């Protein structure tokens, strides 16, 4: 990559300053901003919180549903001391695609709305002065970038997703301006081997120069436990304190660039010594089988939309721990980096998912976008101990040799980017029948999204649903694939407060009964090794006749309170 | 009594015709109806369903909240063949007090809104012609009739209850016109003794004449199992099939009046051979201890108010059976007779409660009203096997010698009216402290209404609540009264759909936790022998700042669906 994905830190060599706050903001329905000098400042802005999705602040439909080009602007004072450092704007994300300007100059553009955007403003930055950043953003959906959809023209544009979740957009994550030394740590990778009571931390370091590198490992108390020299090497850890499920331990890696007797740069990050591998039908963490228990989530909260906030992280993890979960999938896009940092702390397992949802010649361009997002996700997230698997798709077509050749390239790219070569998978929709699917052989383990008892034979037909479920799982069993299966979606829309005896679809009681039936099926097959329910919480969707204020398959409400079924998960996962 | 309480039947000697349907109805705010000939027909009526409470039909406040005099009218054709029978209007109830007119003539008046009103129209009835009935009703509340309250004058009147439940009124139960033979069975009483595998049915019969009486007992198949002669006697039943809790068996008693070789009258009613007695701290049904499990209920349903309907009975009993209940209290007034008939069928136990709720010299008049209601209730309900106890008050003052002398008279009257002398009790409010209460010695067993964890030390103080509860029960225990205790109220207001983690007062989760705490306390005392939760279902109350559309202490919603806590009862009572 032409930039670093490394999370920004502050020390003797690296500086950072937050640009979060109220930005200037303006819609550009006529698409004349770049024609009209907007990159030098917006002509008639309103204020817009950053980080946040813009949609749910407004009281009018056309602003909430805005689709097209729209602009952000802010000003920041740059400390004079940042002079002659490499100065970067770092956006947690820009959703979905955008062009960054600084002091009237075009800096960079990015496609993909859920991963960091880095813009090198070294040559245009004005140390000791007020600087200006302007971002042109677009939130349309197409079939050549992720996530896929269409754009309808009423000249007013309307996003038409091929995915369920609401098309939130804007500057949904924190924005920093940072300063790095001229020769810096750009990237590093760690991989682990367990040796009795000891451990090896294998590493590679990429810098922007040719000076020597020293790598140190500190324990949780900051004590030096290992040290070595070189951009490539092994850190030997005696009596290693392994990072364990729901029982984290984090070391601190310290990467130094040196020039004789002085340090040029120093990067530090918390990491966790752990191994993950698929062995037969088992998922092994540190050589012991683990059964995944948890949820698909979303970045979704009232008013903020996908806007990041530590308070949402904290509540969600307390709820997760209360259910006795150990895992979540980042459905259906990489989350803010902070979610992974916290999962590292709390010992949660993550399946990290690229926004390959909603899946013509456009396909070669789509593949490029999909591979680019995969590269960025893996480079960003590989050193989190929590991240134990990559999900490279959600419910694509998989039953043609055409689909096979496409995903072969994606998986091949993912493999080259992940230093750890940790398990890769994808979530299969029901149409990927065991007799037809061509893509499951690409996977280290198989993830199934199934709604037997909701979309199939729901309600009075739920007994039929269970037989149909068992019939499919019997077909999978007969294949003797010798791989683990994880259910990554299953659930029922459930309106909090809707009670019925006997239960009906949409009642709290039916949600319980549906889950109990699914558990019976899960527990009937030895090779099922994980259950991640859909969804952790009710979340916003495109409005329509099938969505009663978003998706109500949450086990929790949108404001994070338990429906009756939450207790069912709690008791089972205990 | 100057009339029969016997449920109307249809046979060769007795006729009945329903007057249910749309009646004429008119409010009388100026109280001029009797001054203006309304007893001969209402001048400007609207239509009003009977049976029903009138309040919730209207769309305007002043009609819903109407307090004062109001009138009903209907017409009915009397079959010519009813000539020279004793012809009666029979109202299931007239709420709260009223005067019955027929064909322009005043027939009778009644005070008490929850028991049958009989009006002898023999002398004014017109067989083979259309007849007219007009009822003047009043629904004000005072301190000389049950249930007690006040009437506020804004000249518009407003009822101000001393009780929680909404002041529903009108013709809330079915109305019949009936014809009886000139000499008829007016009353009868049965009492049971168990003798090994056999049983004795002791009986008394009251007729309006001097002709001989024969009494027969038929089994559930209609087979003759016993026969005897006389207005007083014993029916000997070999291998009696006892009426059991949740396992009913009903015989049919047949009472004949005879004149040589012909029958003058014949009354039949289903009865159940069972005994109830208090022995030490135990409640014995057929000589075996039973622990009461169930609810206080109400006659309360959307739109109909307290209006009787068999559909409400059926749903409620299915819900009751689903919770594994065996008992309910008729809080806070005798219910429609049909509820008891069905309890007989389903083997449910009933505590039958007079409307002595909401408790000056007015007291001597109040006592007369209270005794009259008690006489009517017991005479009406004594032959139901389901009715195993009389509740003669709900939360009165009991800590003065004054209160003691009052209730001594009530209990004495009840004792003279109940042929079976079955257990008598009353529900005590918390203010009836064990050191102060003078009235608990009058009771065969003690009923406590307690809200430790709701009105006392609720929410964050719930641990304190439990200690306070145990402290009071320890005080009761120290008295060594050697009587059973039944909790007849305990519960929390609970809004369906209100979820919180951790729980808050009013959430579904707090209702569960509150119940679990109460159960722990109950189960800590050997002499506690029953738990009747408040309430079976959410019900209508006077509006106010403490009532969010009525009372929400229901375990079921008003439309009879289970909140989370309903399962807690189900699992415990299984």
PDB file of N, CA and C in Angstrom, chain A residues 315 318-319 322 496-502 508-509 512 556-557 559-564 567, chain B residues 315 318-319 322 496-502 508-509 512 556-557 559-564 567:
ATOM      1  N   UNK A 315     -21.114  -0.660  26.352  1.00  0.00           N
ATOM      2  CA  UNK A 315     -22.398  -1.308  26.630  1.00  0.00           C
ATOM      3  C   UNK A 315     -22.485  -2.640  25.907  1.00  0.00           C
ATOM      4  N   UNK A 318     -20.453  -5.343  27.580  1.00  0.00           N
ATOM      5  CA  UNK A 318     -21.071  -5.800  28.823  1.00  0.00           C
ATOM      6  C   UNK A 318     -22.263  -6.708  28.540  1.00  0.00           C
ATOM      7  N   UNK A 319     -23.038  -6.381  27.506  1.00  0.00           N
ATOM      8  CA  UNK A 319     -24.160  -7.228  27.126  1.00  0.00           C
ATOM      9  C   UNK A 319     -23.669  -8.566  26.609  1.00  0.00           C
ATOM     10  N   UNK A 322     -22.547 -10.712  29.388  1.00  0.00           N
ATOM     11  CA  UNK A 322     -23.677 -11.142  30.201  1.00  0.00           C
ATOM     12  C   UNK A 322     -24.350 -12.344  29.542  1.00  0.00           C
ATOM     13  N   UNK A 496     -40.253  -6.136  20.479  1.00  0.00           N
ATOM     14  CA  UNK A 496     -40.267  -6.088  21.938  1.00  0.00           C
ATOM     15  C   UNK A 496     -41.662  -5.729  22.424  1.00  0.00           C
ATOM     16  N   UNK A 497     -42.168  -6.489  23.388  1.00  0.00           N
ATOM     17  CA  UNK A 497     -43.487  -6.241  23.927  1.00  0.00           C
ATOM     18  C   UNK A 497     -44.598  -7.022  23.243  1.00  0.00           C
ATOM     19  N   UNK A 498     -44.305  -7.619  22.089  1.00  0.00           N
ATOM     20  CA  UNK A 498     -45.301  -8.445  21.413  1.00  0.00           C
ATOM     21  C   UNK A 498     -45.318  -9.835  22.043  1.00  0.00           C
ATOM     22  N   UNK A 499     -46.340 -10.078  22.853  1.00  0.00           N
ATOM     23  CA  UNK A 499     -46.509 -11.353  23.546  1.00  0.00           C
ATOM     24  C   UNK A 499     -47.693 -12.108  23.001  1.00  0.00           C
ATOM     25  N   UNK A 500     -47.544 -13.417  22.837  1.00  0.00           N
ATOM     26  CA  UNK A 500     -48.686 -14.194  22.401  1.00  0.00           C
ATOM     27  C   UNK A 500     -48.581 -15.628  22.897  1.00  0.00           C
ATOM     28  N   UNK A 501     -49.724 -16.163  23.314  1.00  0.00           N
ATOM     29  CA  UNK A 501     -49.869 -17.547  23.765  1.00  0.00           C
ATOM     30  C   UNK A 501     -51.080 -18.167  23.083  1.00  0.00           C
ATOM     31  N   UNK A 502     -50.850 -19.106  22.159  1.00  0.00           N
ATOM     32  CA  UNK A 502     -49.539 -19.595  21.731  1.00  0.00           C
ATOM     33  C   UNK A 502     -48.804 -18.561  20.900  1.00  0.00           C
ATOM     34  N   UNK A 508     -42.151 -12.309  21.103  1.00  0.00           N
ATOM     35  CA  UNK A 508     -40.980 -12.663  21.897  1.00  0.00           C
ATOM     36  C   UNK A 508     -40.923 -14.159  22.168  1.00  0.00           C
ATOM     37  N   UNK A 509     -42.090 -14.780  22.297  1.00  0.00           N
ATOM     38  CA  UNK A 509     -42.147 -16.199  22.616  1.00  0.00           C
ATOM     39  C   UNK A 509     -41.717 -17.045  21.428  1.00  0.00           C
ATOM     40  N   UNK A 512     -37.963 -17.255  21.171  1.00  0.00           N
ATOM     41  CA  UNK A 512     -37.437 -18.307  22.048  1.00  0.00           C
ATOM     42  C   UNK A 512     -37.611 -19.695  21.435  1.00  0.00           C
ATOM     43  N   UNK A 556     -31.200  -8.147  21.499  1.00  0.00           N
ATOM     44  CA  UNK A 556     -31.369  -6.904  22.241  1.00  0.00           C
ATOM     45  C   UNK A 556     -32.089  -5.876  21.383  1.00  0.00           C
ATOM     46  N   UNK A 557     -32.726  -4.914  22.041  1.00  0.00           N
ATOM     47  CA  UNK A 557     -33.303  -3.771  21.352  1.00  0.00           C
ATOM     48  C   UNK A 557     -32.192  -2.849  20.851  1.00  0.00           C
ATOM     49  N   UNK A 559     -31.558   0.127  21.692  1.00  0.00           N
ATOM     50  CA  UNK A 559     -30.941   0.814  22.820  1.00  0.00           C
ATOM     51  C   UNK A 559     -30.372  -0.196  23.825  1.00  0.00           C
ATOM     52  N   UNK A 560     -30.173  -1.427  23.358  1.00  0.00           N
ATOM     53  CA  UNK A 560     -29.334  -2.413  24.038  1.00  0.00           C
ATOM     54  C   UNK A 560     -29.988  -2.995  25.296  1.00  0.00           C
ATOM     55  N   UNK A 561     -31.267  -3.336  25.201  1.00  0.00           N
ATOM     56  CA  UNK A 561     -31.946  -4.008  26.318  1.00  0.00           C
ATOM     57  C   UNK A 561     -32.436  -5.383  25.879  1.00  0.00           C
ATOM     58  N   UNK A 562     -32.426  -6.371  26.798  1.00  0.00           N
ATOM     59  CA  UNK A 562     -32.689  -7.758  26.384  1.00  0.00           C
ATOM     60  C   UNK A 562     -34.156  -8.094  26.120  1.00  0.00           C
ATOM     61  N   UNK A 563     -34.438  -8.723  24.985  1.00  0.00           N
ATOM     62  CA  UNK A 563     -35.737  -9.348  24.801  1.00  0.00           C
ATOM     63  C   UNK A 563     -35.709 -10.664  25.561  1.00  0.00           C
ATOM     64  N   UNK A 564     -36.846 -11.345  25.621  1.00  0.00           N
ATOM     65  CA  UNK A 564     -36.935 -12.604  26.367  1.00  0.00           C
ATOM     66  C   UNK A 564     -35.879 -13.611  25.920  1.00  0.00           C
ATOM     67  N   UNK A 567     -32.073 -14.242  27.434  1.00  0.00           N
ATOM     68  CA  UNK A 567     -31.844 -15.149  28.558  1.00  0.00           C
ATOM     69  C   UNK A 567     -31.592 -16.576  28.068  1.00  0.00           C
TER      70      UNK A 567
ATOM     71  N   UNK B 315     -61.071 -18.121  27.737  1.00  0.00           N
ATOM     72  CA  UNK B 315     -59.661 -17.751  27.593  1.00  0.00           C
ATOM     73  C   UNK B 315     -58.981 -17.727  28.950  1.00  0.00           C
ATOM     74  N   UNK B 318     -58.218 -21.181  30.262  1.00  0.00           N
ATOM     75  CA  UNK B 318     -57.109 -21.806  29.544  1.00  0.00           C
ATOM     76  C   UNK B 318     -55.773 -21.216  29.981  1.00  0.00           C
ATOM     77  N   UNK B 319     -55.741 -19.906  30.221  1.00  0.00           N
ATOM     78  CA  UNK B 319     -54.522 -19.272  30.705  1.00  0.00           C
ATOM     79  C   UNK B 319     -54.187 -19.753  32.103  1.00  0.00           C
ATOM     80  N   UNK B 322     -52.789 -23.162  32.017  1.00  0.00           N
ATOM     81  CA  UNK B 322     -51.463 -23.164  31.413  1.00  0.00           C
ATOM     82  C   UNK B 322     -50.426 -22.763  32.460  1.00  0.00           C
ATOM     83  N   UNK B 496     -45.746  -4.240  29.536  1.00  0.00           N
ATOM     84  CA  UNK B 496     -45.321  -5.193  28.516  1.00  0.00           C
ATOM     85  C   UNK B 496     -44.403  -4.502  27.521  1.00  0.00           C
ATOM     86  N   UNK B 497     -43.269  -5.127  27.228  1.00  0.00           N
ATOM     87  CA  UNK B 497     -42.318  -4.563  26.295  1.00  0.00           C
ATOM     88  C   UNK B 497     -41.241  -3.706  26.943  1.00  0.00           C
ATOM     89  N   UNK B 498     -41.427  -3.346  28.211  1.00  0.00           N
ATOM     90  CA  UNK B 498     -40.402  -2.584  28.918  1.00  0.00           C
ATOM     91  C   UNK B 498     -39.321  -3.537  29.424  1.00  0.00           C
ATOM     92  N   UNK B 499     -38.192  -3.532  28.730  1.00  0.00           N
ATOM     93  CA  UNK B 499     -37.056  -4.386  29.069  1.00  0.00           C
ATOM     94  C   UNK B 499     -35.902  -3.567  29.582  1.00  0.00           C
ATOM     95  N   UNK B 500     -35.234  -4.058  30.620  1.00  0.00           N
ATOM     96  CA  UNK B 500     -34.062  -3.347  31.087  1.00  0.00           C
ATOM     97  C   UNK B 500     -33.081  -4.303  31.750  1.00  0.00           C
ATOM     98  N   UNK B 501     -31.801  -4.072  31.479  1.00  0.00           N
ATOM     99  CA  UNK B 501     -30.689  -4.821  32.062  1.00  0.00           C
ATOM    100  C   UNK B 501     -29.641  -3.840  32.570  1.00  0.00           C
ATOM    101  N   UNK B 502     -29.496  -3.727  33.894  1.00  0.00           N
ATOM    102  CA  UNK B 502     -30.255  -4.455  34.912  1.00  0.00           C
ATOM    103  C   UNK B 502     -31.685  -3.958  35.001  1.00  0.00           C
ATOM    104  N   UNK B 508     -40.313  -5.859  32.689  1.00  0.00           N
ATOM    105  CA  UNK B 508     -40.683  -7.269  32.749  1.00  0.00           C
ATOM    106  C   UNK B 508     -39.699  -8.067  33.591  1.00  0.00           C
ATOM    107  N   UNK B 509     -38.435  -7.659  33.565  1.00  0.00           N
ATOM    108  CA  UNK B 509     -37.403  -8.389  34.288  1.00  0.00           C
ATOM    109  C   UNK B 509     -37.540  -8.188  35.789  1.00  0.00           C
ATOM    110  N   UNK B 512     -40.167 -10.461  37.249  1.00  0.00           N
ATOM    111  CA  UNK B 512     -39.612 -11.791  37.526  1.00  0.00           C
ATOM    112  C   UNK B 512     -38.801 -11.808  38.820  1.00  0.00           C
ATOM    113  N   UNK B 556     -50.634 -11.408  32.965  1.00  0.00           N
ATOM    114  CA  UNK B 556     -51.070 -11.319  31.577  1.00  0.00           C
ATOM    115  C   UNK B 556     -51.464  -9.889  31.244  1.00  0.00           C
ATOM    116  N   UNK B 557     -51.415  -9.557  29.959  1.00  0.00           N
ATOM    117  CA  UNK B 557     -51.934  -8.287  29.478  1.00  0.00           C
ATOM    118  C   UNK B 557     -53.460  -8.292  29.534  1.00  0.00           C
ATOM    119  N   UNK B 559     -55.530  -8.102  27.159  1.00  0.00           N
ATOM    120  CA  UNK B 559     -56.060  -8.983  26.125  1.00  0.00           C
ATOM    121  C   UNK B 559     -55.523 -10.410  26.301  1.00  0.00           C
ATOM    122  N   UNK B 560     -55.032 -10.698  27.505  1.00  0.00           N
ATOM    123  CA  UNK B 560     -54.803 -12.067  27.966  1.00  0.00           C
ATOM    124  C   UNK B 560     -53.585 -12.727  27.310  1.00  0.00           C
ATOM    125  N   UNK B 561     -52.486 -11.990  27.214  1.00  0.00           N
ATOM    126  CA  UNK B 561     -51.237 -12.575  26.705  1.00  0.00           C
ATOM    127  C   UNK B 561     -50.154 -12.504  27.777  1.00  0.00           C
ATOM    128  N   UNK B 562     -49.259 -13.512  27.825  1.00  0.00           N
ATOM    129  CA  UNK B 562     -48.324 -13.606  28.957  1.00  0.00           C
ATOM    130  C   UNK B 562     -47.145 -12.634  28.913  1.00  0.00           C
ATOM    131  N   UNK B 563     -46.894 -11.938  30.015  1.00  0.00           N
ATOM    132  CA  UNK B 563     -45.629 -11.238  30.163  1.00  0.00           C
ATOM    133  C   UNK B 563     -44.588 -12.278  30.545  1.00  0.00           C
ATOM    134  N   UNK B 564     -43.329 -11.866  30.615  1.00  0.00           N
ATOM    135  CA  UNK B 564     -42.244 -12.801  30.932  1.00  0.00           C
ATOM    136  C   UNK B 564     -42.501 -13.556  32.234  1.00  0.00           C
ATOM    137  N   UNK B 567     -44.359 -17.216  32.800  1.00  0.00           N
ATOM    138  CA  UNK B 567     -43.608 -18.469  32.722  1.00  0.00           C
ATOM    139  C   UNK B 567     -43.039 -18.851  34.090  1.00  0.00           C
TER     140      UNK B 567
END
